């Protein structure tokens, strides 16, 4: 799993390179798409661990009130909207050389 | 008008201390292309805008 | 996405409760949507779209006030003064199109 | 009591500090205090401080600042150019001025560390500057005279009417601080986000840490305002 | 420019004027003076959406 | 310790003053000081000063704003307009809020100074302000709440949601500073006439005296100072 806690992903939007972003295929199309699928899998995996932790810290109320306070469970819901957003995080990995990918078209 | 200046550094400490104009005429030490292209330092005169 | 937040942090369990929060504007709404908007970008469009230029991307930022803040910039893209002229917004959903 | 109302920081938060350049936070601010704060201090920081710095310089077989002095690569134009960029910070107290004469032989670069031996009252800040570059077999005198002043002068104004002949009058600059800049962001408080955020910039020459700087200027002003009272 | 004169006004209403948030004084003298200005029913609440 | 040879003023001097303007000097300073201190304090004078203002009126017989009282030439709307141009000034300490029940009758003109017979912690500064104009056969049964503040305060905000039924609220202008300007003029002190002089004219509102006003400024920026230590 990925260390999130350490990602060098930039938080907000911003100014990428191209150039750099395109290097390695030689159509920044192609390079958008990889991204794109290597997120979905990114927000698929950070789901799941956001899921599992607050299932841990997850607290039966049997109140009919509309509105709970969990403190710890807002805690660790702000500590995972504080990281960067998933598309943010595969185009780092995607700089640093860290997403496989394979034309199976072109393998065929 | 007419100072010289180490680099960009002392023209502003001028202009911050309002010894300098901002539209005078100086002469001041920094990197600029040579005629084949490399990069030295020469004393350019200019302006501290 | 405001919704989503609302549920993942506990507050409310159902989407009416989540909705009925962000009706009344209350100080939380504004806290999930600062980090909501951060790697989020809108559309920033102007009729008529005469070249492509008059479609851009732009990190949004709460502001105060009912009129959308835009950069210097972008006017000449867009042919777009500050003599009345509105923009329409677009917001990207899916990561492909983000 | 009555200043519940009124947003106030708590602290100055220092995002990154060497011994050169410094950055600080001052958040919450009431809309347009951060100006104020700012300005006020750029002010003092640029205005106020004290330092010490080259005044003159004399070397041999020169009578101007336009002429060559055989042996070394830089004119003397450019001598006196690498001479403005020597820093002093005082070693013994009460030390105003000192006129330190040097001879420097069999080295091929003149650096300011050599003049640390040769200067007593005052230690050089920049011991790595390159002043002249020469040949082995060429041998220099100096005679710098280090004074005391604020801000930035002019040789005009340094100009003295009892200098030796041949000395060549020197810009100075005294002030410690090389460049002060602030920006103002807003800062969201609760509802509201026309709160205002103030970070500063202070470069320094390494006689005073940017912090110290930046604590003598809220000094100052404090002094100054207390006469209200 | 007789009106002016008699209520103590700058020629061609042209003033120095200071700087609200520093203080300090603009490098040119700008045109100041009473202007009739009219709100149009292109407001903002209505076109928010 | 380096703070030796910088001229700091010894006190402000008032010139001339009264409950509604006031003159002070400030002198000796540096060059460039009269310019910080005269800007901070006038930015802190017009922006932060504390005041007293109208936040809710309730007419008898009147519902909305929008209406009409019977015998009165004035429409709700301008009465509420020249409410909110009322003056205050504080009569007995540690008063913040006051309810107001106003019964005039028998006038053909409601002024301020009619409040004053049931105002209580708070003196009407222009009484001569007059609400409405009235026939002799209307009487007019108001009440108004008195509240502190700073700055401005739309009547968005000031609206309470246990007001009684017909609670109109108001825009409330809580500033008590009219006017600041400031002068800076050279001064000579024994052989140097590069210090300055520092010339200080503020308009009040007669809420708070000139001097106070200064003062509670000079509070607000060592506050703001202090942080910086
Ligand atoms: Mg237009």
Redesign the interface.
């Known amino acids: 799993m990925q260390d999130l806690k350490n990602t060098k992903a930039?938080?907000?939007?911003a100014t990428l390179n191209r150039n750099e972003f395109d290097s390695k295929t030689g159509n920044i199309y192609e390079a958008?798409?990889i991204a794109?699928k290597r997120?979905?899998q990114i927000?698929s995996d950070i789901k799941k661990e956001?899921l599992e932790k607050?299932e841990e810290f997850?607290t039966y109320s049997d109140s009919l009130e509309?509105?709970?306070?969990?403190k710890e469970?807002?805690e660790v819901?702000?500590f995972?909207?504080?990281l960067?957003?998933?598309?943010?995080l595969?185009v780092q990995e995607w700089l640093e050389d860290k997403i496989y990918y394979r034309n199976t078209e072109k393998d065929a | 008008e007419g100072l010289t200046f180490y680099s960009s550094e002392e023209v502003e400490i001028a202009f911050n201390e309002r010894k300098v104009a901002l539209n005078a005429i100086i002469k001041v030490r920094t990197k600029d292309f040579n005629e084949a292209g490399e990069l030295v330092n020469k004393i350019i005169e200019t302006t501290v805008g | 996405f405001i919704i989503r937040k609302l549920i993942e942090r506990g507050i409310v369990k159902t989407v009416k409760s989540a909705k009925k929060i962000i009706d009344k504007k209350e100080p939380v709404v504004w806290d999930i949507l600062e980090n909501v908007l951060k790697g989020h970008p809108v559309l920033l469009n102007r009729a008529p779209t005469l070249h492509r230029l008059g479609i851009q991307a732009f990190q949004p930022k709460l502001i105060e006030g009912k009129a959308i803040r835009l950069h210097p910039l972008a006017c000449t893209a867009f042919n777009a003064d500050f003599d009345g002229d509105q923009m329409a917004v677009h917001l990207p959903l899916g990561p492909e199109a983000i | 009591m009555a200043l519940l109302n009124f947003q106030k920081p708590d602290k100055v938060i220092m995002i990154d500090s060497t011994d050169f350049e410094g950055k600080f936070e001052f958040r919450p601010l009431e809309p347009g205090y951060g100006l104020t704060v700012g300005n006020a201090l750029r002010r003092v920081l640029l205005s106020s401080l004290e330092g010490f710095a080259i005044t003159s310089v004399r070397i041999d077989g020169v009578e101007h600042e336009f002429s060559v002095v055989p042996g070394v690569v830089e004119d003397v134009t450019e001598i006196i150019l690498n001479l403005k960029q020597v820093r002093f910070k005082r070693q013994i107290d009460d030390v105003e001025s000192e006129t330190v004469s040097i001879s420097v032989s069999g080295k091929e670069q003149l650096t300011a560390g050599d003049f640390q031996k040769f200067i007593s009252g005052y230690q050089v800040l920049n011991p790595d500057l390159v002043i002249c570059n020469m040949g082995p077999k060429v041998s220099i005198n100096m005679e710098i005279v280090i004074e005391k002043g604020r801000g930035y002068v002019p040789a005009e104004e340094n100009k003295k009417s009892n200098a030796p002949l041949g000395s060549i009058a020197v810009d100075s600059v005294y002030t410690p601080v090389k460049n002060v800049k602030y920006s103002i962001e807003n800062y969201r408080v609760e509802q509201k986000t026309d709160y205002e955020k103030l970070v500063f910039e202070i470069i320094t020459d390494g006689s005073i840490h940017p912090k110290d700087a930046l604590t003598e200027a809220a000094k100052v002003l404090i002094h100054h305002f207390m006469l209200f009272s | 420019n007789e009106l002016t004169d008699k209520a103590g006004v700058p020629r061609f209403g042209h003033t120095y004027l200071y700087d609200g948030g520093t203080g300090q004084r603009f490098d040119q003298a700008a045109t100041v003076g009473v202007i009739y200005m009219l709100k149009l029913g292109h407001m903002v609440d209505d076109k928010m959406h």
């Open positions: 930039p938080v907000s939007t958008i798409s794109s997120a979905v927000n956001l607050l997850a509309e509105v709970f306070e969990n469970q807002i819901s702000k995972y909207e504080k960067p957003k998933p598309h943010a595969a």
